[PDB]
Amino acid sequence: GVIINVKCKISRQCLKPCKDAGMRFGKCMNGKCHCTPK
């Protein structure tokens, strides 16, 4: 999946730009934003 090395203080901060790009999921994991494609 498309994992971004952005500090996920919260999953919503990752998912917002991810689902807008084409990531149906966006979960904060180990410090990275795990954005699974739409």
Side-chain angles (χ1 to χ4, degrees):
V2 184
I3 280 62
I4 59 180
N5 61 327
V6 180
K7 162 76 288 194
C8 52
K9 304 293 294 188
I10 41 181
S11 295
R12 58 168 299 172
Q13 74 176 89
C14 311
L15 177 64
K16 192 291 182 296
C18 286
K19 189 183 299 190
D20 188 68
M23 294 78 184
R24 116 177 54 147
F25 293 116
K27 189 183 186 69
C28 170
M29 290 295 303
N30 291 29
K32 277 67 185 181
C33 305
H34 281 218
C35 299
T36 321
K38 188 70 173 63

